[PDB]
Design a protein around this ligand. Structure first.
Ligand SMILES: Nc1ccc2c(NC3CC3)nc(-c3ccccc3)nc2c1
Ligand SMILES: OCc1cccc(OCc2ccccc2)c1
Ligand SMILES: OCc1cccc(OCc2ccccc2)c1
Length: 336
């Protein structure tokens, strides 16, 4: 029951895709993505060709990870899989992997780098990020790399979180300091940085390196007090922290002058240096700032996600074969 494939060369590489996808045209370069038209649905879609999916053990595992994560995400504010295919007829000739998802208008960098945003828009966009995160977090997945370029927004201001400017600007302070045991709330920190940027047209913490970045952070949120410092396991990290000149916590209502006071309040709750005290995604959705969008009955959580594979060390052929299994067992979504 194989579809008919067709070949073509687009700048860099070849492309071998079922006839169902038409008028492929590049959108940029981990992999490279083409805008296509999808004849089965009439929707514009993006087809990503993975670059050398099984070049190493790491690539192999990463190809598998991404396919696993994509197959699991079924939610309005998160990128989902319309299709995955290979030109291979057998495991033995399995070498190329292509992923298909909805094409979305632009990204959040292409929306904050056009104007500021008005308050009503920021509410809607941050709301949708939080609702997508609540879902992702409920599967015990941590995004880790949230930033404007990872948020796809279309012409209707609908937002989808995806994966794949500096990443550093959005990273939680615990990650910079190399804490092994950070949790989900690293993603809340990033959301906080995103929201502030949307409200001011400015990157909140545009650090030039990780040391700068921390200095910029502590300057706003203050240096750690005693209850936090007592939870820091690394002697050297604790020293860096305690040796850098003490800074006081800033009044956010002064730093975010003229912003809505409910947005200032959310921001205070998001950008807590101590990750144990940071508001979660579920809690942030019930904050007042979102009172016109919030519905506790249309804020779904995810099915369980098995990421036991993350702790496994496998051969390149075994990661590859696990990926093949997943390409074959893929069930297309309800085409509605
Ligand atoms: N329960 C917690 C809460 C917050 C923490 C935090 N926060 C960093 C100030 C941003 N950092 C660290 C840590 C541990 C080892 C090496 C480097 C950093 N641990 C934390 C443990
Ligand atoms: O995240 C997997 C994937 C698949 C195909 C394209 C892709 O990035 C391009 C893209 C373009 C427009 C909206 C969302 C993604 C990502
Ligand atoms: O990284 C967590 C996460 C959150 C939302 C979507 C998601 O899909 C993962 C992924 C998406 C696109 C390309 C590669 C991986 C992952």
């Amino acid at each position: 029951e194989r579809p008919t494939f067709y070949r073509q060369e687009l700048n860099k590489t070849i492309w071998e895709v079922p006839e169902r996808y038409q008028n492929l045209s590049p959108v940029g370069s981990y992999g490279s993505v083409c805008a296509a038209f999808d004849t089965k649905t009439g929707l514009r879609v993006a087809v990503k060709k993975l670059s050398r999916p099984f070049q190493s053990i790491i690539h192999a595992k990463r190809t598998y990870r991404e396919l696993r994560l994509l197959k699991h995400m079924k939610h309005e504010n998160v990128i989902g899989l319309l299709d995955v295919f290979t030109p291979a007829r057998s495991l033995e000739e399995f070498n190329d992997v292509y992923l298909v998802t909805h094409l979305m208008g632009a990204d959040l960098n292409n929306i904050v780098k056009c104007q500021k945003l008005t308050d009503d828009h920021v509410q809607f966009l941050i709301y949708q990020i939080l609702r997508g995160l609540k879902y992702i977090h409920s599967a015990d997945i941590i995004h880790r790399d949230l930033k404007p370029s990872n948020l796809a927004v279309n012409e209707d201001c609908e937002l989808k979180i995806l994966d794949f400017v500096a990443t550093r600007w959005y990273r939680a302070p615990e990650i910079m300091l190399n804490w092994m045991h950070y949790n989900q709330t690293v993603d809340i920190w990033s959301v906080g940085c995103i929201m502030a940027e949307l409200l001011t047209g400015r990157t909140l913490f545009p650090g030039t390196d990780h040391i700068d970045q921390l200095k910029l952070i502590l300057r706003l949120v203050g240096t750690p007090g005693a209850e936090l410092l007592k939870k820091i396991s690394s002697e050297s990290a604790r020293n860096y922290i305690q040796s850098l000149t003490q800074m006081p916590k800033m009044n956010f209502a002064n730093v975010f002058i003229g912003a809505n006071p409910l947005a200032v309040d959310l921001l205070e709750k998001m950008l807590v240096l101590d990750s144990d005290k940071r508001i979660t995604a579920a809690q942030a959705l019930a904050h007042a700032y979102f009172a016109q969008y919030h519905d506790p009955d249309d804020e779904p959580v995810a099915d369980p996600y098995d990421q036991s594979f993350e702790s496994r060390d496998l051969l390149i052929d075994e990661w590859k074969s696990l990926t093949y299994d997943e390409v074959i067992s893929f069930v297309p979504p309800p085409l509605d």
